[PDB]
Each structure stands twice: as C-alpha cells, then as structure tokens.
Design an enzyme around this catalytic site. Structure first.
Site, PDB file in Angstrom:
ATOM      1  N   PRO A   1       0.975  -1.109  -0.006  1.00  0.00           N
ATOM      2  CG  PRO A   1      -0.958  -1.471   1.419  1.00  0.00           C
ATOM      3  CD  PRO A   1       0.346  -2.139   0.939  1.00  0.00           C
TER       4      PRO A   1
ATOM      5  CG  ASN B   1      -9.340  11.036  -4.343  1.00  0.00           C
ATOM      6  OD1 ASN B   1      -8.509  11.959  -4.698  1.00  0.00           O
ATOM      7  ND2 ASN B   1     -10.607  10.977  -4.313  1.00  0.00           N
TER       8      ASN B   1
ATOM      9  CB  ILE C   1      -2.524  -5.013  -4.403  1.00  0.00           C
ATOM     10  CG1 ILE C   1      -1.658  -4.105  -5.639  1.00  0.00           C
ATOM     11  CG2 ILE C   1      -3.045  -6.341  -5.297  1.00  0.00           C
ATOM     12  CD1 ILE C   1      -0.228  -4.819  -5.609  1.00  0.00           C
TER      13      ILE C   1
ATOM     14  CE  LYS D   1      -2.516  -6.672   1.125  1.00  0.00           C
ATOM     15  NZ  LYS D   1      -2.941  -7.892   0.959  1.00  0.00           N
TER      16      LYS D   1
END
Lengths: 114, 114, 114
Positions: free
Chosen positions: A1, A97, A64, A32
């Site tokens: 990330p 976002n 992801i 993660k």
C-alpha cells in the site's frame, strides 16, 4: 500500500515520527506488512478547499485489494484522526481518494505483482 | 471535485486570486457547490512535455460523477483557457486526466461519501 | 503517455539529461512518439518505503492504451533500471502504478482525445 498526503501545513508542523507512525498504523489497518507500506508527505502546498485556505489535505491510498466500502470508512476515520491529531487539520478539510489496484498494474523490483 | 495542476511555471507567475478563480469556475462547470471544491497548484516543477521544457502542465480532475465525454471536452476547454490566460501555458502543452470517483472510494470527515 | 517520479533523492543527484532520456526511452517502450510523452521528476520528497527512509521512488505511468500484464513487466524492468542507474535507487525500493486511460478522460489542446 501507498499513502500520500498533500497539505498546506508547513514543513515545521509535521512531527518527527509522522512517517513511522503512518507506516505502522497503515500496516495494522490494511493487514499488510510494513515492508510493503510506502508513505509520502508533501507540506507547504498552495491549495484551497471549499473556498478557504485554512489547513487542509488532499490524500490518496492505493492498495492491491483491501479497498472497499467498509474498509474505506474505517481508513477514513483512522487517517482523518491522525491528520487532526498530528497536523491539526480538521477532518472536514480532508479528501482521501482510494484506489484498488490490479496486481498487474503495479511495478516493483523489475517486474509487477501479477 | 478536486483539481490539481502541476507545472514548470515559476511560483511568482501564479497570480493572486488563481485558486479562487479555479474554485469558482469549477463549481460552475461541474454544477457542484464551491464548498465541495478543492484546488491545488504546484509550480516550479521539473518536467518536459513533447521533448521540450517550455511552459507545460500535467493536471487532474477527480469528481464523484460529472465526468464523461462531453463534459470532459467542456472542462478541457475551460481549464486550458484558464491556464493559457493566467499562467501563459499553451493548451497544446497541457494534459488533464479525468477520474470519475466512486463515492465509496472518497473519504472525508471521518467517513466516505457512500 | 505521462510518467511521474516522486523521490527522496536530492535534486543535485538528478542528472542533466534525465528528463530527455526518460522521454526517449518511454517513446521506444510504449511505441508512442516523443511528441506525446510527458515526464515529471519530483526530488527532495519526505517519504518512507518499507519502514526505511533510504532512497526510494513512488511513480506512475498513465497511457491511453499500451498498458497490460506483459507490457507493464517490461516497463518496470526498464524504469527500475533507469532509476537504479541514474538516481541510485534500488529496484526493490520503487513502486510504479500503471493506468490505462480512456481517451475520453484525457484532456489536451482544449478538447479530449476521444
């Protein structure tokens, strides 16, 4: 990330430890490991939010997977809480976002994650 | 909506009032109120466009809806016109990426817009 | 195509010629002419990657087509190789987000590419 924060708050107001704390909190929130987490803070920006140049932030989190309706609500609470506490930016002056990236569209280490 | 402009034009060439004018013009073009508009200008960048380092701009407009073929043509005319007029960047040296954001993928005020 | 590199490497470590070399190499790799290529390098950033502040890069490549599994693997080898060679950033400290843009969502020259 990968988390990026762009803000008009001055560089001297970003506390020492802020990138480390973002890394640790994002690792916990996304599930993660920290080895995969990248963070980027960009202070001193020329920006306006809702017709005011008071402290604000324009941010993005790319991952992801681990992106979706409930998780994003949870990230937004966490990340607004951090920006409020550390950079004194009110939560209603932050946009984040969220991007759920396909493994094939993320390069790293001479290849992609596909 | 959020509009970002990255350019090699120097900071002293960005006129006072540019962020307010972007806010007002984007509010009118998107139909969204100015309270929801965020604008970000990043001058003095190291960039090239078509093998030249003459004035250029790399931009983005993110919006929850109000993005589509005709609207984007209209935004591009508007935005290139402003950048030409205010920053002296020729329209053929501007790229604007348009993103139609899902409400669940935009955080604000401790939650998302979903 | 548009390539952007954000890095904690200092401005004085970006070699003269780096933007031209990125332009040329991206033109060959994407098959698009250099007239269409835009490149942006942003040094001196406050950033961390995998809990370390050693040299890293957060990048993106946006293109109207020419994005996909095999091409992105190819781009990632190419672009990590350049960043290693020119900026001394190890490939395992680079992320590159790839975006396949719809022509209707890219503005330029007062219109879009649709």
């Amino acid at each position: 990330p990968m988390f990026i924060v762009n803000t008009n708050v001055p560089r001297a107001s970003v506390p020492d430890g802020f990138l480390s704390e973002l890394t640790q909190q994002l690792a916990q929130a996304t599930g993660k490991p920290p080895q995969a987490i990248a963070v980027h803070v960009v202070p001193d920006q020329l920006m306006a939010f809702g017709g005011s140049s008071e402290p604000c932030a324009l941010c993005s989190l790319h991952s992801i997977g681990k992106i979706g309706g409930a998780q994003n609500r949870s990230y937004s609470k966490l990340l607004c809480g951090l920006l409020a506490e550390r950079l004194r930016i009110s939560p209603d002056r932050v946009y984040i976002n969220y991007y759920d990236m396909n493994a094939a569209n993320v390069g790293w280490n001479n290849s992609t994650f596909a």
